[PDB]
């Protein structure tokens, strides 16, 4: 329902899981007016096309404040049309404005990521790619989960979805049962949320990121697909990301409790939202 000839290229925004996202002016009157939007397209196999159409449907089915807004599609090679958010990714915003973002603000974002995820759960959706690079900023007070490219629907009958053909993955955000048995759940999204909260309290220092930090603990000399093996074994032996500099005990406990080897012990997003809110209301 969006006409290709009316989408005017302004600039690239970045590359996602498969395809890429552009900033365009939608100008169907062909005057000067018309909103700016974000346009996703594939760089395109059949397997990817199937997934992209699933992604569109997932995004269409979501209405939440903490989820990026679907606007429409563009047929002629599919295009997904979304709201454009001018502050960009949380990782970029945080790096740009690090000096005016205090711990309270960080827990406000944390709280909003929890709400959006709690909402994902009610629809039995598994995000699988929770990371600050995937969170967008709407304004200094509101963030939105974007990129639903790897998101899966739980079948009506099972509490986990096994992912056939695991391509090159965000391995440092993955729960152990995801790395071993390709098993994805509300519990694995909770683990990843734990890494997101870790990212926030490091303020995305380069050397403090989850990849830099696990490679430290494995050894920079280790290589290839050995990396994944050493990571699985490290996690089995209760090796964990360190407490970020300036991160209080109470906050670290949320992270370590999210990073439980036992799937059933990991807290719920309902618990995480409430717990975060109180620590926030404790300052
Ligand atoms: N609504 C959007 O998709 C969107 C809106 N405004 C934006 N401003 C900068 C990126 C961006 C958007 N998507 C970006 C795209 C996909 C994914 C999430 C974003 C950052 C990323 O690195 C990874 C590239």
Swiss-Prot record:
Keyword Kinase: yes
Annotated catalytic residues: 129 (proton acceptor)
Keyword Nucleus assigned: yes
GO CC, alphabetical: caveola; cytoplasm; cytoplasmic side of plasma membrane; cytoskeleton; cytosol; endosome lumen; euchromatin; extrinsic component of cytoplasmic side of plasma membrane
Annotated positions binding ATP: 13-21, 40
One GO process term, biological-process aspect: positive regulation of T-helper 17 type immune response
Tissues in which the UniProt entry reports expression: Ubiquitously expressed throughout most tissues.
GO molecular function: acetylcholine receptor binding; ATP binding; growth hormone receptor binding; heme binding; histone binding; histone H3Y41 kinase activity; identical protein binding; insulin receptor substrate binding
Phosphotyrosine: residues carrying this PTM: 26, 119, 125, 160-161
Keywords recorded for this protein, A-Z: Adaptive immunity, ATP-binding, Chromatin regulator, Chromosomal rearrangement, Cytoplasm, Disease variant, Immunity, Innate immunity, Kinase, Magnesium, Membrane, Metal-binding, Nucleotide-binding, Nucleus, Phosphoprotein, Proto-oncogene, Repeat, SH2 domain, Transferase, Tyrosine-protein kinase, Ubl conjugation
Domain Protein kinase: 7-277
UniProt PTM: Autophosphorylated, leading to regulate its activity. Autophosphorylation on Tyr-26, Tyr-119 and Tyr-125 in response to growth hormone (GH) are required for maximal kinase activity. Also phosphorylated by TEC. Phosphorylated on tyrosine residues in response to interferon gamma signaling. Phosphorylated on tyrosine residues in response to a signaling cascade that is activated by increased cellular retinol.
Location(s) in or outside the cell: Endomembrane system; Cytoplasm; Nucleus
Functional description taken from the UniProt entry: Non-receptor tyrosine kinase involved in various processes such as cell growth, development, differentiation or histone modifications. Mediates essential signaling events in both innate and adaptive immunity. In the cytoplasm, plays a pivotal role in signal transduction via its association with type I receptors such as growth hormone (GHR), prolactin (PRLR), leptin (LEPR), erythropoietin (EPOR), thrombopoietin receptor (MPL/TPOR); or type II receptors including IFN-alpha, IFN-beta, IFN-gamma and multiple interleukins.
Disease linkage: Chromosomal aberrations involving JAK2 are found in both chronic and acute forms of eosinophilic, lymphoblastic and myeloid leukemia. Translocation t(8;9)(p22;p24) with PCM1 links the protein kinase domain of JAK2 to the major portion of PCM1. Translocation t(9;12)(p24;p13) with ETV6. Budd-Chiari syndrome: A syndrome caused by obstruction of hepatic venous outflow involving either the hepatic veins or the terminal segment of the inferior vena cava. Obstructions are generally caused by thrombosis and lead to hepatic congestion and ischemic necrosis. Clinical manifestations observed in the majority of patients include hepatomegaly, right upper quadrant pain and abdominal ascites.
Annotated family: Belongs to the protein kinase superfamily. Tyr protein kinase family. JAK subfamily.
Record remark: domains: Possesses 2 protein kinase domains. The second one probably contains the catalytic domain, while the presence of slight differences suggest a different role for protein kinase 1.
Subunit structure of this chain's protein: Interacts with EPOR, LYN, SIRPA, SH2B1 and TEC. Interacts with IL23R. Interacts with SKB1. Interacts with STAM2. Interacts with IFNGR2 (via intracellular domain). Interacts with LEPR (Isoform B). Interacts with HSP90AB1; promotes functional activation in a heat shock-dependent manner. Interacts with STRA6. Interacts with RHEX; this interaction occurs in a erythropoietin (EPO)-dependent manner. Interacts with ASB2; the interaction targets JAK2 for Notch-induced proteasomal degradation. Interacts with MPL/TPOR.
The protein, known as: Tyrosine-protein kinase JAK2
Organism: Homo sapiens
Shown segment, full-protein numbering: 843 to 1130 of 1132
